[PDB]
C-alpha cells in the first residue's frame, strides 16, 4: 500500500495472507468470507505468462495477522488448503477479466477478536454503494512504493471509486463490466494505491444502512503504483457472485 497508514489491531479481521511454503514469502492478500472459504485473485495463483501455477500444496493461508513477518503466536491461525477453484472464464491472456478464485480450507477456522468474516454484497447493497466519489478501503502488506519499502505491519488506505469513462481513458487495456477502478485524480491533492503484494486483497465498504462491512472488490491490477493519471483496478465481486454461490453450494461442507 502506497501512502497509507498503519492499521489498528483488529481493524480488518477478514484480511488473509497468502503465504508460499518454500521459499517462504508473501504471495498476495485474500479475504475470509466464512469459516472455511477464502476469496482472492485468480492471478495470484495462475498466470502462465510468468510460469505461475500454484497448487493447494504450495501454499498456506495465515489469518488474524497484523505484523507482516512475525509468527504471531496465540493470535494468528495458519491453515492448509483443501481445494482451489479458479473462475472458468478468467482471462489471463488479455486483461485479467474475471480475476477471482475461491480456496477451501482443510479445516474450519475458529473466529476470535482478530479473525472474523466480511460480508458479500447483495444486489441492493452494490447498487447503493458502488458509485463514483464513494470511498472504499484497501488493506495489505504489499510494497510501500513502486520500487522499494516493505511495511512492518498491515497498511490501510481509503480510496474513491472513479467514473468508468475516466478509468477507460487512463489505460490502453480493454476494461470490462467485471472491473471497476479506484484512486484519486491528479488534481485532488490526495493519493494512495495498492502495490505489489496487495493483490488478491479486499476493497471493502461499510454500509450506512446496517453498519456492516461488505467486500465490493478484489485488488486485481494496476500499471505501476500510485502514478498520477493512473488507477487501480478491482474485480467486481457482485457481478461474479452467482459463480461464488455456485462453488460453495456444490463443494461446501
Amino acid at each position: 500500500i502506497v501512502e497509507g497508514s498503519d492499521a489498528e489491531i483488529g481493524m480488518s479481521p477478514w484480511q488473509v495472507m497468502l503465504f508460499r511454503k518454500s521459499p517462504q514469502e508473501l504471495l498476495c492478500g485474500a479475504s475470509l468470507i466464512s469459516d472455511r472459504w477464502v476469496l482472492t485473485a485468480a492471478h495470484c495463483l495462475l498466470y502462465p505468462p510468468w510460469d505461475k501455477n500454484f497448487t493447494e500444496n504450495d501454499l498456506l493461508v495465515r489469518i488474524g495477522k497484523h505484523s507482516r513477518t512475525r509468527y504471531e503466536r496465540n493470535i494468528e491461525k495458519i491453515s492448509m488448503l483443501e481445494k482451489i477453484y479458479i473462475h472458468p472464464r478468467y482471462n489471463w491472456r488479455e486483461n485479467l477479466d474475471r480475476d477471482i478464485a475461491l480456496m477451501k480450507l482443510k479445516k474450519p477456522v475458529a473466529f476470535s477478536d482478530y479473525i472474523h468474516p466480511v460480508c458479500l454484497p447483495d444486489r441492493e447493497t452494490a447498487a447503493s454503494l458502488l458509485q463514483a466519489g464513494y470511498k472504499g478501503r484497501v488493506t495489505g502488506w504489499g510494497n510501500l512504493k513502486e520500487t522499494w519499502g516493505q511495511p512492518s505491519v498491515l497498511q490501510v488506505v481509503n480510496l474513491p471509486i472513479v467514473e468508468r469513462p475516466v478509468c477507460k481513458d487512463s489505460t490502453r487495456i480493454r476494461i470490462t463490466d467485471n472491473m471497476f477502478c479506484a484512486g484519486y485524480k491528479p488534481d485532488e491533492g490526495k493519493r494512495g494505491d495498492a502495490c505489489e503484494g496487495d493483490s488478491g486483497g479486499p476493497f471493502v465498504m461499510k454500509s450506512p444502512f446496517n453498519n456492516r462491512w461488505y467486500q465490493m472488490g478484489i485488488v486485481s491490477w494496476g500499471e505501476g503504483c500510485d502514478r498520477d493519471g493512473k488507477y487501480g483496478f478491482y474485480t467486481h465481486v457482485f457481478r461474479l457472485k452467482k459463480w461464488i454461490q455456485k462453488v460453495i453450494d456444490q463443494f461446501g461442507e
Binding site: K21, Q24, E25, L26, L60, T69, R70, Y71, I78, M80
Partner: peptide
C-alpha cells in the same frame, strides 16, 4: 525477512 513458522504446518 519472515520468522519461521511451526513445522506442524509444513508437513
Amino acid at each position: 525477512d519472515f520468522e519461521e513458522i511451526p513445522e506442524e504446518y509444513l508437513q
